Amino acid sequence: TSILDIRQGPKEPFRDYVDRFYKTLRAEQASQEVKNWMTETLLVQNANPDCKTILKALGPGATLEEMMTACQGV
Amino acid sequence: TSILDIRQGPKEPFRDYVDRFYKTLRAEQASQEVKNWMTETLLVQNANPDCKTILKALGPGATLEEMMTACQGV
Amino acid sequence: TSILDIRQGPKEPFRDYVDRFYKTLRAEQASQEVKNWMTETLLVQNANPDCKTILKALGPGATLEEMMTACQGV
Amino acid sequence: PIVQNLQGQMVHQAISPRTLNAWVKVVEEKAFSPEVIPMFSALSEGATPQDLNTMLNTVGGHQAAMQMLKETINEEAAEWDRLHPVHAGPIAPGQMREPRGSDIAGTTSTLQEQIGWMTHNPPIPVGEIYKRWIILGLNKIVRMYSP
Amino acid sequence: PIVQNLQGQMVHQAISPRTLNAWVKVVEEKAFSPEVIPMFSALSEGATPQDLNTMLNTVGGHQAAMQMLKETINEEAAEWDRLHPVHAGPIAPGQMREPRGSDIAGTTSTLQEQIGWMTHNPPIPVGEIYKRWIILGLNKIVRMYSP
Amino acid sequence: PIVQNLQGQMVHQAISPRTLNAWVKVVEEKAFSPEVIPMFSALSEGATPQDLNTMLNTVGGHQAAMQMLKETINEEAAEWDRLHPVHAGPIAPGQMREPRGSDIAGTTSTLQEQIGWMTHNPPIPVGEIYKRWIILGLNKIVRMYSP
């Protein structure tokens, strides 16, 4: 399965999705800079509308514990 | 789950509650003095009315074997 | 079971067939040159029409990752 | 790990498979539970950075946590480099080089280099520095993964 | 494997059955998962080519992958022979012969020969050359077997 | 088996129960599968004929195969005797006797005799001769027991 095919379900906790992401990211062998680009970009983009909304409110500069606690009720 | 969210049921033995308390207290990393404050304070406060009543009669200076044997029939 | 009796189903993924082939090839004890001949020949020949068609388009010189990714949707 | 031999010297010996598997099994069974940290600490006795990356790299599952840890290890390493600047002028022929955050993380150093630093006199405890970063990052995880 | 004895010399000792079985069990359980590569690397510590063919030959199942690996090992070996030509004139009585791709793959060399190369001064790391080919071929597999 | 001791001599040591049981378990689980042959080969490292009959005699089940093997071992042994005739005149006091097919099969020789031949200088590899017969007979079985 390709990294672009990794997406969050409509009922799937973000948490279970983030695990899937760094597992597939774990099978990507690209430069770190590209993998940083993938992190800030693709993760949020394939996140579900309800959490996506939430993550837009965190702004930039956000870290994984704060994202992970931010989308917990969703 | 937060330490403030730890409370004793209306039918729950104190014993099962005290176990829950020092497990959650086991995941708190605060100074010992603060954790002493939590011990004497929060434990009794979230204890159920029937045992709470019992514990008020032990007075201060009480230790865990005496609290644990004090609320046994409740 | 003989190596000539190894064939791909009409709904069977190629992948599951290629596994069967090198398992049976694993129980053949013939010279390497003969086993090379078996590889390029018998594998494609007993492959199903839909994939067979696909494999004909790869031409010669093809390697197993490219064959295996080539017949994936079939 | 680097262990003391019968002769009375410190030499490297490899870690054992049922030690490896015991590390695996702990993680399988108790996931993020606090008992993992003393457990880790015991099984990391006399361990190298190299052995510590081996233990972290051999994890399966909990990849969100594994990434959070990595990023904590690099932050703590960035902080090592900040706090301890490189030293004045060229490296002496008679001496061996001071470590960076990445040598502590095992990344830029070789095993023989990791044995030089630890076995040499004075010895430098690059295991124990990485160990605190691991334990610190373990606290981060434990605190987050509390529900 | 070739291990250091108490006396302070490098001697060959056989690999253990519960090591063997641990190799088997890893493959059974985690198939093509990435954790297999650090795992391999730890269990291949101090290992010979001969022991590495033993480990590859003792696999059951995943024969498409096992063939892809073989063919990668031969390609990497063909490449060894290409990059390193044979040396000028006859082999000296005082010296031992340079390895080929097939000696690295363990095929054309004997154990005592594999111990000569590794134990001799300078030593040549024919394990580590095969190890990269195995790891490289492991990447090929992992990348393919991603779904 | 005959193993090298710390002192630097070749001495006999007994094979281990969890080695024995590992041999049993392989046969239980993988029956006639090809992985049995490398597996055998590893567990037969440094083994005597006597230990090899022990391993064959301790099988349960697959008695048609066990008989086919026996009969292959005797054929290969008959062939040893054919190809290598007995030598000229009486046996020297200063020397020890040449083996027959049945000494290789372990039958007519004693352990101390099996240790004489292997430890002596030049050594004779009576294990490796029986080993090929076992592997050859293993091919016969594998080929038949393919379905």
XYZ file of C-alpha atoms in Angstrom:
663
model
C 0.000 0.000 0.000
C 1.210 3.502 -0.948
C 1.542 6.455 1.596
C -1.051 8.514 -0.432
C -3.525 5.687 0.133
C -3.288 6.180 3.959
C -6.447 8.111 5.071
C -8.547 8.518 8.236
C -11.961 6.904 8.441
C -15.105 8.847 9.213
C -15.413 6.981 12.655
C -11.701 6.005 13.024
C -9.783 7.616 15.865
C -6.948 9.845 14.707
C -4.684 7.975 17.009
C -5.240 4.724 15.085
C -4.546 6.644 11.868
C -1.370 8.270 13.116
C -0.048 4.814 13.985
C -0.817 3.688 10.436
C 0.951 6.768 9.090
C 4.288 6.329 10.854
C 4.202 2.562 10.066
C 3.888 3.322 6.309
C 6.320 6.315 6.741
C 8.540 3.648 8.476
C 8.507 1.776 4.943
C 9.344 4.924 3.054
C 13.082 5.338 2.520
C 13.094 9.160 1.232
C 15.352 12.036 2.461
C 14.414 13.395 5.944
C 13.397 16.841 4.504
C 10.905 15.084 2.209
C 9.642 12.961 5.029
C 9.212 16.259 7.116
C 7.199 17.638 4.193
C 5.047 14.493 4.247
C 4.503 14.814 7.968
C 3.199 18.357 7.989
C 1.252 17.921 4.808
C -0.243 14.547 4.114
C -1.238 13.642 7.698
C -3.620 16.596 8.028
C -4.879 16.448 4.474
C -6.111 12.851 4.805
C -7.415 13.421 8.290
C -11.328 13.313 8.607
C -13.418 16.641 8.385
C -14.255 16.649 12.138
C -10.614 16.359 13.245
C -9.365 18.266 10.290
C -11.417 21.190 11.531
C -9.800 20.692 15.045
C -6.258 20.591 13.628
C -6.771 23.711 11.597
C -7.448 25.507 15.043
C -4.118 24.282 16.517
C -2.271 26.459 13.882
C 1.288 25.687 12.777
C 4.152 24.865 15.132
C 2.066 22.104 16.752
C 3.626 18.837 18.116
C 2.341 15.271 18.197
C 1.186 15.038 21.868
C -0.836 18.261 21.361
C -2.334 16.958 18.057
C -3.037 13.606 19.617
C -4.721 15.123 22.710
C -6.443 17.680 20.449
C -8.410 15.153 18.365
C -9.265 12.717 21.225
C -13.032 13.299 21.531
C -13.603 13.143 17.799
C -7.665 9.742 33.229
C -6.850 12.582 35.659
C -6.335 12.078 39.504
C -9.337 14.431 40.229
C -11.503 12.061 38.199
C -10.722 9.172 40.647
C -13.797 8.748 42.951
C -15.415 5.986 45.029
C -18.642 4.402 43.857
C -21.758 4.270 45.990
C -21.414 0.366 46.248
C -17.632 0.151 45.528
C -15.417 -1.048 48.359
C -12.946 1.559 49.556
C -10.238 -0.978 49.144
C -10.862 -1.182 45.384
C -10.793 2.624 45.280
C -7.581 2.965 47.241
C -5.917 0.632 44.747
C -7.136 2.868 41.924
C -5.802 5.906 43.771
C -2.215 4.751 44.256
C -2.169 3.403 40.650
C -3.098 6.881 39.301
C -0.835 8.503 42.007
C 1.797 6.013 40.617
C 1.353 7.958 37.155
C 1.681 11.335 38.793
C 5.260 12.610 38.768
C 4.821 15.704 41.316
C 7.043 16.573 44.348
C 6.553 14.238 47.375
C 5.102 17.089 49.549
C 2.414 17.662 46.904
C 1.739 13.986 46.638
C 1.409 13.921 50.549
C -1.113 16.753 50.210
C -3.014 14.692 47.631
C -3.008 11.675 49.895
C -4.528 13.316 52.937
C -6.901 15.415 50.922
C -8.255 13.966 47.735
C -8.631 10.341 48.901
C -11.129 11.234 51.636
C -12.900 13.911 49.648
C -13.822 11.532 46.811
C -14.619 8.717 49.180
C -18.424 7.753 49.353
C -20.738 9.354 52.103
C -20.996 6.094 54.129
C -17.218 5.617 54.383
C -16.562 9.291 54.393
C -18.593 9.467 57.577
C -16.432 6.541 58.988
C -13.148 8.248 58.062
C -14.170 11.506 59.633
C -14.436 9.474 63.003
C -10.846 8.143 62.669
C -9.570 11.793 63.065
C -6.176 12.889 61.735
C -2.940 10.963 62.222
C -4.565 7.811 60.799
C -2.599 5.204 58.722
C -3.617 3.043 55.778
C -4.186 -0.327 57.564
C -6.470 1.466 60.071
C -8.363 3.282 57.248
C -8.596 0.096 55.258
C -9.889 -1.952 58.229
C -12.102 0.998 59.231
C -14.187 1.076 56.033
C -14.436 -2.733 55.514
C -18.142 -3.296 56.261
C -19.261 -0.365 54.157
C 2.525 -33.178 -7.895
C 4.609 -32.583 -11.048
C 5.925 -29.069 -12.155
C 3.891 -29.331 -15.452
C 0.762 -29.687 -13.327
C 1.379 -26.212 -11.749
C -1.029 -23.721 -13.464
C -2.717 -20.396 -12.644
C -6.424 -20.307 -11.914
C -8.837 -18.103 -13.812
C -9.433 -15.966 -10.572
C -6.130 -16.842 -8.783
C -3.654 -14.018 -8.286
C -0.388 -14.526 -10.135
C 1.402 -13.874 -6.925
C -0.172 -16.950 -5.305
C 0.824 -18.948 -8.393
C 4.403 -17.736 -8.447
C 4.750 -18.880 -4.838
C 3.466 -22.310 -5.858
C 5.938 -22.364 -8.742
C 9.124 -21.716 -6.774
C 7.927 -24.150 -4.045
C 7.595 -26.959 -6.651
C 10.794 -25.656 -8.420
C 12.283 -25.864 -4.842
C 11.493 -29.774 -5.073
C 13.056 -30.079 -8.488
C 16.716 -31.080 -8.314
C 17.722 -30.390 -12.159
C 20.774 -28.424 -13.461
C 20.488 -24.605 -13.030
C 20.391 -24.017 -16.853
C 17.360 -26.324 -17.075
C 15.736 -24.651 -14.138
C 16.391 -21.219 -15.928
C 14.660 -22.682 -18.988
C 11.719 -23.694 -16.785
C 11.533 -20.238 -15.284
C 11.285 -18.290 -18.509
C 9.090 -20.845 -20.167
C 6.662 -22.738 -18.018
C 5.689 -19.887 -15.656
C 4.265 -17.739 -18.459
C 2.783 -20.615 -20.403
C 0.613 -21.783 -17.490
C -0.247 -18.263 -16.475
C -4.003 -17.268 -17.052
C -5.080 -15.476 -20.386
C -5.633 -12.079 -18.668
C -2.155 -11.985 -17.094
C -0.616 -13.873 -19.922
C -1.676 -11.023 -22.170
C -0.038 -8.555 -19.630
C 3.230 -10.521 -19.516
C 3.487 -10.695 -23.261
C 3.571 -6.753 -23.160
C 6.509 -6.721 -20.682
C 8.718 -8.324 -23.448
C 11.833 -10.344 -22.611
C 14.500 -9.272 -20.125
C 11.832 -8.769 -17.436
C 12.493 -9.444 -13.684
C 10.262 -10.801 -10.937
C 9.331 -7.530 -9.125
C 8.271 -6.048 -12.503
C 6.253 -9.203 -13.404
C 4.739 -9.303 -9.961
C 3.755 -5.598 -10.018
C 2.679 -5.995 -13.664
C -0.052 -8.588 -13.024
C -1.370 -7.109 -9.721
C -4.792 -5.830 -10.850
C -5.625 -8.997 -12.730
C 27.116 -4.492 26.169
C 30.496 -3.801 27.781
C 31.090 -6.171 30.603
C 34.006 -7.083 32.826
C 35.937 -10.233 31.816
C 37.439 -12.744 34.187
C 41.040 -11.349 33.468
C 39.791 -8.004 35.057
C 39.276 -5.837 32.008
C 36.221 -4.278 30.424
C 35.409 -6.018 27.044
C 32.386 -5.916 24.742
C 30.070 -9.036 24.636
C 26.917 -9.337 22.610
C 23.419 -9.234 24.155
C 21.579 -12.543 24.509
C 18.549 -13.699 22.265
C 16.341 -14.553 25.321
C 17.338 -11.081 26.663
C 16.255 -9.630 23.271
C 13.044 -11.625 23.322
C 12.391 -10.636 26.963
C 12.609 -6.986 25.775
C 10.191 -7.800 23.007
C 7.757 -9.623 25.283
C 7.667 -6.770 27.894
C 6.618 -4.362 25.145
C 4.090 -6.788 23.797
C 2.486 -7.359 27.160
C 2.693 -4.117 29.148
C 2.815 -1.570 26.179
C 3.143 1.967 27.777
C 2.690 0.774 31.497
C 5.193 2.367 34.072
C 6.784 -0.960 34.915
C 8.319 -0.814 31.555
C 10.850 1.872 32.848
C 12.562 -0.107 35.760
C 12.345 -3.123 33.461
C 14.154 -1.237 30.684
C 16.668 0.063 33.202
C 17.613 -3.450 34.423
C 17.864 -4.862 30.858
C 19.945 -1.771 29.898
C 22.610 -2.447 32.476
C 26.026 -2.034 30.861
C 24.425 -1.385 27.469
C 25.861 0.690 24.539
C 24.096 3.345 22.412
C 24.366 0.961 19.616
C 22.486 -1.640 21.703
C 19.926 0.960 22.752
C 19.206 1.829 18.975
C 18.915 -1.919 18.372
C 16.275 -2.228 21.131
C 14.314 0.877 19.759
C 14.613 -0.202 16.135
C 13.444 -3.743 16.869
C 10.042 -2.449 18.180
C 6.867 -3.338 16.210
C 3.720 -1.413 16.592
C 3.006 1.863 18.617
C 4.550 3.947 15.835
C 3.104 7.180 16.943
C 4.931 6.759 20.249
C 8.074 5.526 18.506
C 8.111 8.644 16.392
C 7.465 10.890 19.523
C 10.411 9.223 21.204
C 12.707 9.697 18.209
C 11.890 13.329 18.060
C 12.535 13.600 21.911
C 15.873 11.768 21.430
C 16.881 14.362 18.689
C 15.610 17.240 20.873
C 17.600 16.056 23.855
C 20.603 15.452 21.495
C 20.189 19.075 19.980
C 20.205 20.267 23.565
C 23.432 18.277 24.233
C 25.152 20.075 21.422
C 23.836 23.444 22.505
C 24.944 23.088 26.197
C 28.266 21.578 25.409
C 30.016 23.568 22.654
C 32.895 21.986 20.613
C 36.307 22.555 22.242
C 39.231 24.878 21.394
C 41.409 24.208 18.375
C 42.409 20.813 16.704
C 42.053 17.404 18.293
C 45.328 16.182 20.074
C 47.121 13.030 18.672
C 47.425 11.765 22.224
C 43.668 12.085 22.852
C 40.355 11.053 21.557
C 37.598 13.395 20.467
C 34.761 14.743 22.635
C 31.245 13.284 21.791
C 28.355 15.185 20.248
C 24.505 14.519 20.657
C 24.646 12.189 17.659
C 27.651 10.219 19.125
C 25.504 9.786 22.285
C 22.635 8.686 20.134
C 25.125 6.272 18.631
C 24.585 7.583 15.127
C 27.987 9.251 14.383
C 30.034 7.005 16.547
C 31.359 3.525 15.906
C 31.411 0.715 18.520
C 35.088 0.899 19.065
C 34.622 4.598 19.602
C 31.762 3.889 22.112
C 34.105 1.395 23.928
C 36.996 4.081 23.864
C 34.949 6.655 25.769
C 33.422 4.269 28.374
C 36.619 2.149 29.018
C 39.078 4.985 28.942
C 40.236 6.848 32.136
C 38.235 9.123 33.048
C 35.310 7.340 31.485
C 32.331 9.261 30.086
C 28.774 7.851 30.650
C 27.189 8.313 27.263
C 24.799 5.327 28.086
C 23.544 7.144 31.143
C 22.993 10.393 29.159
C 21.004 8.548 26.488
C 19.251 6.597 29.311
C 17.898 9.822 30.887
C 16.636 10.962 27.414
C 14.910 7.584 27.048
C 13.476 7.763 30.545
C 12.420 11.444 30.002
C 10.827 10.533 26.698
C 9.242 7.540 28.483
C 7.622 9.973 30.969
C 6.265 12.004 27.992
C 4.733 8.903 26.556
C 3.370 7.513 29.858
C 1.747 10.958 30.594
C 0.199 11.170 27.167
C -0.902 7.581 27.047
C -2.653 7.825 30.375
C -6.435 7.915 29.517
C 30.255 -17.939 14.217
C 33.787 -16.778 15.042
C 33.974 -15.629 18.592
C 36.720 -14.660 20.997
C 37.816 -17.390 23.449
C 38.827 -16.849 27.035
C 42.607 -17.371 26.105
C 42.250 -14.161 23.904
C 42.081 -15.614 20.422
C 39.383 -15.697 17.782
C 38.008 -19.310 17.358
C 34.969 -20.727 15.570
C 31.993 -21.973 17.742
C 28.751 -23.333 16.415
C 25.460 -21.384 16.531
C 22.930 -22.408 19.180
C 19.600 -24.394 18.479
C 17.423 -21.839 20.400
C 19.266 -19.148 18.346
C 18.362 -21.153 15.193
C 14.785 -21.562 16.350
C 14.579 -17.855 17.286
C 15.566 -17.112 13.645
C 12.876 -19.478 12.489
C 10.217 -18.028 14.781
C 10.931 -14.380 13.720
C 10.312 -15.372 10.103
C 7.223 -17.298 11.015
C 5.720 -14.441 12.959
C 6.775 -11.181 11.297
C 7.319 -12.485 7.644
C 8.537 -9.432 5.557
C 8.027 -6.767 8.401
C 10.968 -4.193 8.820
C 11.794 -5.373 12.316
C 13.135 -8.428 10.721
C 16.282 -6.416 9.560
C 17.652 -5.184 13.016
C 16.620 -8.597 14.324
C 18.659 -10.341 11.615
C 21.540 -7.963 12.250
C 21.716 -8.804 15.988
C 21.439 -12.586 15.378
C 24.119 -12.231 12.640
C 26.693 -10.798 14.989
C 30.020 -12.541 14.391
C 28.429 -14.857 11.825
C 30.139 -16.575 8.814
C 28.919 -16.794 5.188
C 28.480 -20.403 5.789
C 26.170 -19.590 8.733
C 24.336 -16.991 6.657
C 23.627 -19.671 3.855
C 22.451 -21.985 6.642
C 19.965 -19.344 7.877
C 18.700 -18.664 4.228
C 18.542 -22.344 3.316
C 16.635 -23.264 6.469
C 13.698 -20.947 5.481
C 10.301 -22.544 4.673
C 7.705 -20.751 2.717
C 7.879 -17.291 0.894
C 9.706 -18.898 -2.031
C 9.105 -16.123 -4.417
C 10.964 -13.804 -2.048
C 13.639 -16.420 -1.379
C 14.275 -16.696 -5.082
C 14.338 -12.807 -5.461
C 16.908 -12.678 -2.695
C 19.085 -15.386 -4.247
C 19.117 -13.591 -7.513
C 20.021 -10.271 -5.644
C 22.814 -12.132 -3.787
C 24.239 -13.365 -7.209
C 23.789 -9.874 -8.715
C 25.613 -8.236 -5.843
C 28.260 -11.047 -6.045
C 28.609 -10.489 -9.937
C 29.095 -6.842 -9.084
C 31.811 -7.782 -6.521
C 33.740 -9.583 -9.190
C 33.297 -6.782 -11.684
C 34.494 -3.985 -9.291
C 37.331 -5.947 -7.868
C 39.338 -7.612 -10.663
C 41.659 -10.609 -9.898
C 45.195 -9.500 -8.956
C 48.523 -9.564 -10.849
C 50.318 -12.835 -11.474
C 50.419 -16.096 -9.316
C 49.375 -16.358 -5.694
C 52.373 -15.977 -3.195
C 53.314 -19.022 -0.968
C 53.514 -16.658 1.980
C 49.971 -15.346 1.398
C 46.443 -16.414 1.034
C 44.243 -15.739 -1.965
C 41.916 -12.755 -2.457
C 38.119 -13.615 -2.265
C 35.664 -13.521 -5.149
C 31.792 -12.864 -5.030
C 31.227 -16.597 -4.597
C 33.774 -16.808 -1.679
C 31.762 -13.966 -0.048
C 28.601 -15.873 -0.721
C 30.384 -18.757 0.952
C 29.969 -21.019 -2.047
C 33.618 -21.393 -3.255
C 35.208 -20.987 0.094
C 35.661 -23.466 2.911
C 35.207 -22.623 6.627
C 38.851 -22.672 7.379
C 39.279 -20.317 4.472
C 36.475 -18.049 5.875
C 38.279 -18.110 9.304
C 41.701 -17.319 7.509
C 40.408 -14.088 5.982
C 38.519 -12.781 9.072
C 41.175 -13.803 11.725
C 44.213 -12.876 9.723
C 45.939 -9.420 10.002
C 44.570 -7.194 8.226
C 41.233 -8.923 8.418
C 38.703 -8.683 5.577
C 34.951 -8.309 6.449
C 33.334 -10.714 4.045
C 30.370 -11.088 6.571
C 29.735 -7.370 6.410
C 29.839 -7.378 2.565
C 27.335 -10.242 2.396
C 25.337 -8.499 5.194
C 24.852 -5.341 3.071
C 23.697 -7.543 0.107
C 21.223 -9.231 2.462
C 20.063 -5.919 3.871
C 19.855 -4.396 0.322
C 17.914 -7.406 -0.887
C 15.783 -7.094 2.277
C 14.908 -3.503 1.244
C 13.894 -4.825 -2.230
C 11.612 -7.327 -0.626
C 10.148 -4.962 2.013
C 9.404 -2.371 -0.775
C 7.762 -4.940 -2.984
C 5.859 -6.627 -0.220
C 4.397 -3.374 0.994
C 0.695 -3.438 -0.163
C 29.988 -35.532 19.200
C 33.730 -34.831 19.101
C 34.404 -31.275 20.016
C 37.461 -29.201 20.805
C 38.191 -28.675 24.530
C 39.560 -25.528 26.080
C 43.085 -27.204 26.506
C 43.189 -27.397 22.604
C 42.476 -31.053 21.982
C 39.623 -32.891 20.330
C 37.546 -34.839 22.976
C 34.163 -36.568 22.852
C 31.179 -34.860 24.665
C 27.643 -36.135 24.706
C 24.809 -34.511 22.714
C 22.337 -32.363 24.647
C 18.642 -33.405 25.534
C 17.153 -30.130 24.116
C 19.319 -30.823 21.004
C 17.807 -34.357 20.925
C 14.319 -32.991 21.427
C 14.904 -30.298 18.770
C 15.736 -33.174 16.360
C 12.560 -34.900 17.409
C 10.413 -31.786 17.057
C 11.735 -30.968 13.515
C 10.664 -34.434 12.376
C 7.339 -34.120 14.091
C 6.567 -30.786 12.514
C 8.102 -30.727 9.030
C 8.106 -34.571 8.281
C 9.729 -35.008 4.767
C 9.960 -31.169 3.951
C 13.367 -30.008 2.371
C 14.212 -27.771 5.302
C 14.812 -30.882 7.206
C 18.192 -31.374 5.298
C 20.033 -28.049 6.245
C 18.463 -28.486 9.677
C 19.915 -32.000 9.982
C 23.240 -30.741 8.673
C 23.536 -28.021 11.364
C 22.486 -30.397 14.195
C 24.970 -32.982 12.796
C 27.942 -30.695 13.145
C 30.814 -32.630 14.716
C 28.615 -35.709 15.120
C 29.729 -39.410 15.204
C 28.216 -42.395 13.336
C 27.135 -43.628 16.637
C 25.257 -40.341 17.204
C 23.806 -40.490 13.696
C 22.385 -44.098 14.397
C 20.998 -42.704 17.658
C 19.170 -39.916 15.769
C 17.785 -42.461 13.125
C 16.853 -45.059 15.725
C 15.047 -42.534 17.914
C 12.543 -41.719 15.076
C 8.854 -42.648 15.572
C 6.513 -42.974 12.710
C 7.213 -42.809 8.861
C 8.467 -46.401 8.911
C 8.236 -46.930 5.247
C 10.681 -44.061 4.771
C 12.843 -45.249 7.657
C 13.130 -48.635 6.031
C 13.913 -47.011 2.564
C 16.664 -45.023 4.227
C 18.151 -48.063 5.967
C 18.282 -49.934 2.749
C 19.948 -46.828 1.046
C 22.463 -46.651 3.938
C 23.358 -50.410 3.364
C 23.479 -49.854 -0.424
C 25.797 -46.897 -0.071
C 27.829 -48.919 2.525
C 27.983 -51.999 0.056
C 29.228 -49.519 -2.508
C 31.896 -48.267 -0.031
C 33.234 -51.756 0.330
C 33.151 -52.388 -3.393
C 35.044 -49.149 -4.343
C 37.549 -49.398 -1.587
C 38.979 -52.939 -1.398
C 40.727 -54.182 1.819
C 44.472 -53.408 1.823
C 47.572 -55.597 1.302
C 48.651 -58.071 3.954
C 48.281 -57.898 7.845
C 47.484 -54.785 9.832
C 50.683 -52.967 11.199
C 51.181 -52.769 15.049
C 52.057 -49.111 14.630
C 48.801 -48.358 12.773
C 45.116 -48.623 13.039
C 42.867 -50.462 10.623
C 41.129 -48.994 7.557
C 37.263 -48.635 7.905
C 34.661 -50.629 6.007
C 31.009 -49.558 5.030
C 29.769 -50.976 8.329
C 32.441 -49.027 10.357
C 31.147 -45.881 8.567
C 27.636 -46.890 9.423
C 28.948 -47.216 12.953
C 27.877 -50.831 13.233
C 31.282 -52.646 13.373
C 33.173 -49.862 14.987
C 33.350 -48.797 18.608
C 33.352 -45.146 19.790
C 36.963 -45.138 20.684
C 37.616 -46.487 17.228
C 35.418 -43.691 15.702
C 37.430 -41.113 17.777
C 40.795 -42.802 16.600
C 40.039 -42.257 12.914
C 38.678 -38.668 13.198
C 41.281 -37.368 15.782
C 44.278 -39.104 14.334
C 46.656 -37.413 11.788
C 45.611 -37.572 8.808
C 42.028 -37.728 9.947
C 39.384 -39.598 7.938
C 35.853 -38.050 7.608
C 33.624 -41.033 8.170
C 30.843 -38.588 9.437
C 30.926 -36.749 6.142
C 30.736 -40.032 4.145
C 27.722 -41.201 6.155
C 26.317 -37.622 5.903
C 26.291 -37.754 2.068
C 24.509 -41.186 2.225
C 21.942 -39.629 4.571
C 21.555 -36.573 2.374
C 21.375 -38.783 -0.795
C 18.803 -41.002 0.861
C 17.021 -37.810 1.990
C 16.777 -36.735 -1.687
C 15.267 -40.178 -2.521
C 12.674 -39.701 0.140
C 11.899 -36.030 -0.651
C 11.460 -36.968 -4.389
C 9.189 -39.862 -3.591
C 7.213 -38.053 -0.960
C 6.503 -35.145 -3.246
C 2.783 -35.547 -4.264
